[PDB]
Amino acid sequence: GDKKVIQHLNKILGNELIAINQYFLHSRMWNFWGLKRLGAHEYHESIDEMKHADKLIERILFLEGLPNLQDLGKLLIGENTQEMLQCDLNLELKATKDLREAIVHCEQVHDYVSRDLLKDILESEEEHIDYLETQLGLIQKVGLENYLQSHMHE
Amino acid sequence: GDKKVIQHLNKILGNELIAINQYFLHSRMWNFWGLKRLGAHEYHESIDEMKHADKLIERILFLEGLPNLQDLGKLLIGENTQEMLQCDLNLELKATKDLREAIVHCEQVHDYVSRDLLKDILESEEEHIDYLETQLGLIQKVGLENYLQSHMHE
Amino acid sequence: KGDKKVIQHLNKILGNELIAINQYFLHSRMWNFWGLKRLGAHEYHESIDEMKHADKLIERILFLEGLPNLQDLGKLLIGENTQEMLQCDLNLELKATKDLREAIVHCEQVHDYVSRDLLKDILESEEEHIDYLETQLGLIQKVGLENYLQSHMHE
Amino acid sequence: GDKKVIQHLNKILGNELIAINQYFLHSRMWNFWGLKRLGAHEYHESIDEMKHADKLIERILFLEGLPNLQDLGKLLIGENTQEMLQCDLNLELKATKDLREAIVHCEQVHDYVSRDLLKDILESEEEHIDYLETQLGLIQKVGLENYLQSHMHE
Amino acid sequence: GDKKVIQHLNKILGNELIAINQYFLHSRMWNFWGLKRLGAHEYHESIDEMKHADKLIERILFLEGLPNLQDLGKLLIGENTQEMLQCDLNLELKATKDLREAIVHCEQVHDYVSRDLLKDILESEEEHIDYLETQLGLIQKVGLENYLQSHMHE
Amino acid sequence: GDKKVIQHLNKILGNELIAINQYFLHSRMWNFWGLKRLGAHEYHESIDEMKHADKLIERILFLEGLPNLQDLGKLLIGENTQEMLQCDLNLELKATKDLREAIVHCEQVHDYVSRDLLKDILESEEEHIDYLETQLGLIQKVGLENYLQSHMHE
Amino acid sequence: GDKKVIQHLNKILGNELIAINQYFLHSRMWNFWGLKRLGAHEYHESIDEMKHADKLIERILFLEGLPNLQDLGKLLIGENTQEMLQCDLNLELKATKDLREAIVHCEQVHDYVSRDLLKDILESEEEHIDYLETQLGLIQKVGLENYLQSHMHE
Numbered sequence A, B, D, E, F, G: 001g002d003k004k005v006i007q008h009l010n011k012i013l014g015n016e017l018i019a020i021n022q023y024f025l026h027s028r029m030w031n032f033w034g035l036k037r038l039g040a041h042e043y044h045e046s047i048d049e050m051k052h053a054d055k056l057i058e059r060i061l062f063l064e065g066l067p068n069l070q071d072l073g074k075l076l077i078g079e080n081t082q083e084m085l086q087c088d089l090n091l092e093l094k095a096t097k098d099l100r101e102a103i104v105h106c107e108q109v110h111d112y113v114s115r116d117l118l119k120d121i122l123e124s125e126e127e128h129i130d131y132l133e134t135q136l137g138l139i140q141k142v143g144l145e146n147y148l149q150s151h152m153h154e
Numbered sequence C: 001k002g003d004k005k006v007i008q009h010l011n012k013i014l015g016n017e018l019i020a021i022n023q024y025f026l027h028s029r030m031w032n033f034w035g036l037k038r039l040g041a042h043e044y045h046e047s048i049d050e051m052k053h054a055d056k057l058i059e060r061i062l063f064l065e066g067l068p069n070l071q072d073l074g075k076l077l078i079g080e081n082t083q084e085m086l087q088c089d090l091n092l093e094l095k096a097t098k099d100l101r102e103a104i105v106h107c108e109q110v111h112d113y114v115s116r117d118l119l120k121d122i123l124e125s126e127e128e129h130i131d132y133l134e135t136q137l138g139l140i141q142k143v144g145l146e147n148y149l150q151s152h153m154h155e
């Protein structure tokens, strides 16, 4: 395995580990508040990050690197729905920047299989960004109280 | 059967008999107002207290005590949705306080089967407290009118 | 919206149902405790039937814009053995039916025909309970107490 | 594994071994006499004691103790139905006293899983005591001859 | 019922009671060690002995004897698989010797039904001897480590 | 919500978060090596810890504490099967010690629902300790090469 | 169709033709030795190379090139399991080297559909490399004789 590919893959892994925990706690906060539709959506977002972490771990091991599950960076935890959505969005904008940097390097060293894994993760993160921007926009269009009302029941 | 255990069990049963009637009336009031989702939920809370009452009666009889279904304490009847939910919450905080006291005494006299029964009731009353706190929080987050609207239809 | 005295009558019938619910639920669990499971099961169904009658009275009182009274619980008639328990249920039902007839009279007088119909349905069911109770007491005499109890051991 | 917990568990195991044999014999005596409903019921009680003994043996071995299946205490065999039911009841009153002492001890040394195993056995033995006292009461209520009649057919 | 027949049936029954407990403990020992295939087979041998005991108890009662479930002989408990297997084998060789003597005596006094019962028990114990000798032979042919490995999984 | 209960629950949650990542990495290491039976079992151990962590987060929120998903303690990563099993066992021994201390405190302040939650986690960790010790015992009884051989296929 | 793209595709097709025959012969050698699990796995590796050749042949025709099925390079045939696995691995390392050079060129001349086809082949060859290095590592971990024993049966 190329050394900087492994480094990049461990950096993406690191970002996924932050997002697993952030989304899981956000899901459980939403469920606690009785906003069960947000909580369920955010739970599935956490599970998707878990699956990506799994694929990254497996690839790092095949390339004979050491997956780093020890370093957990800063969780962005909001205190209300609007903040939590914006925190998830801030995290995803950092995650896609790093994914693009990793894909650029993979292409340069001809690691096309790693590039393809990272591109699939990127597509999934951009769909999350689409979801988050749509939610923030809906809060503006229907108002916050209606937007929360619409997320009470699954 | 330990005399004080029978006394605590009859105290818990007295609490259940209040909650049966309070929840049933609150249920039928919400149904009458067309808030059928609140009515259905509160109906199931009444049924669950009927089941706990039944388990308490069976245990008191096995311990050779006299179940007391004669003394009905004070019902806390609200006159609107907010008051009714806070009356249920006030009832449950007293119920759990008495359950903790019954559990301590069961342990002290080695009545572990009565303790286990009481702990199962306690877990179910904590779940009701959780629901009730959540509803009061949703009234604040979505507004009362939206909250009621969301409880019109089952 | 409703007639005030109709509501008072319906709250009085409701009060009788709330006694019956508790009395029959306790008798049922006493019979189960003693191993007389067929009696226990029948009495449990009588208790459930009174619960449903109470539900219909509560719903009708609310519709009529009265306040259902679930706070006042009158005197439970609890027996010490099977024969007393059956007589206690019978004593309760005889009072219940007297009050039903008085409430039906009043509904009729003020033209509350839907309330009268609800109360007649309750009365039919309570008379069926009286038939059951009188029949059991008669069977205790015909087959003897020990055989009667024996026949109610198994469901 | 706590040495005194293991001694308590072997003590309870010893009682179960007595009960297995006592109830199995009582079952086959009732079947021999044609009281097939008593015989079937007592067979199931014996089977339940066999399952408790299994769980005790598995727990003792996990705690690194030696399960004692060698010491068989005194079986209380009756000569007729009324004595047999009282022998079973005498055995269970001794059995539940030992269980309560064992639970106290497991609780103090923080062996909460052992305590939970013993609590499940205790609930089962209290159910047996309920059955036993109910049968003795029924003999008084319906008369011995009717009582036995009712236990001829399964 | 012939007095010595009944003595022989209580002797065989006494042997069954030892085997029940020995095999049951050996089963749970094997399970505790993760040799689940040995544990499962030895559990089924214990159950088989339980069923023989039941048939003996029933026959003793019909003959108007007193089944003796009080006297529990010495359990032969091994410390490892080879010893446990040899212990079972030693117990069975004693059991079949006793069964042959009982059959001789039943034939002598013309209790042909008891003889037939004992013969069916004998056939089953000889099948257990077959299994045990085959296992000890396999340890020799495949080696102990392989033999144990082959009994890890059910 | 009692402040020290919440501290205990967050300490147990910290333990779960370590175990999730340690077991997940060990699972994927074993899969990478072709020891797919070990990899599958360790995956399920990790998912089980994830589920425990979920329940802790929900209880901490209901008690109006802040769940700590930010602090990740030291993963104990082995470099061969024997060491990985021992690292799992060391983690589980610390985990159960902390569970017992939390259960004591819950009992002390009468938080019987938290204690019940903790006791179910404790039973699950003790089953894991049972598995781990059995595996280490098997390596000694069948030899390391046979033990690994038996864990190649699912 | 770009002339050098066609030449690269014909080079990869040449590598697939070697792999087809080498893996097929290895498969039947393993079957002949009674190592049916290896022979079954290697048969499926051969089929996969057959399917890759088919996709290459189709793409070359579409680009108006001449598929070259005439030139068969050097088969690497081993004479025991360890050698056959290392021969497969040597062939795959060469194959993946050529695939990367082919993809680089497709990207330069903007033949993204050919690049897509080769990247899919490349991922499949890296999975085969994963398998081969895993098998070689298992031979070391469980020993040759156990490794081969584990591959006698399908």
Ligand code: HEM
Pocket (backbone or CB within 6 Å): B017, B020, B021, B024, B047, B050, B051, B053, B054, C018, C021, C022, C025, C048, C051, C052, C054, C055, C070
């Ligand atoms: C105001 C007093 C009560 C009312 C209005 C009431 C009402 C009801 C109703 C409407 C049902 C559903 C029955 C059906 O449709 O099958 C029910 C069920 C039941 N009730 Fe009550 N009830 C009352 C008091 C009690 C009390 C004091 C007990 C004592 C244990 C009790 C025990 C039960 C039980 C065990 C069931 C069956 C629940 C189940 O397992 O699904 N009820 N009740």
Ligand code: HEM
Pocket (backbone or CB within 6 Å): D017, D020, D021, D024, D047, D050, D051, D053, D054, E017, E020, E021, E024, E047, E050, E051, E053, E054, E069
């Ligand atoms: C007098 C001695 C015993 C007798 C006569 C006896 C009899 C029986 C019988 C007749 C069965 C049902 C077998 C079948 O048809 O499947 C059985 C099952 C069983 N026995 Fe025993 N048994 C004895 C002692 C024991 C002992 C000491 C243990 C130790 C645990 C034990 C454990 C079990 C278990 C676990 C079952 C399966 C129960 C189930 O899950 O259905 N038995 N026994």
Ligand code: HEM
Pocket (backbone or CB within 6 Å): A017, A020, A021, A024, A047, A050, A051, A053, A054, A057, F017, F020, F021, F024, F047, F050, F051, F053, F054, F069
């Ligand atoms: C706070 C940490 C985590 C929590 C609370 C958590 C929680 C969960 C839960 C509740 C499930 C569903 C389990 C079920 O009911 O079957 C799950 C699934 C899963 N988790 Fe995690 N998890 C966490 C961390 C991780 C990490 C770090 C990874 C991988 C590196 C991971 C990988 C997975 C995988 C692969 C699944 C199965 C997903 C699927 O295919 O459905 N999880 N997790």
Ligand SMILES: [K+]
Pocket (backbone or CB within 6 Å): C147, C150, D146, D149
């Ligand atoms: K009779």
Ligand SMILES: [K+]
Pocket (backbone or CB within 6 Å): E146, E149, F146, F149, G146, G149
């Ligand atoms: K082997």
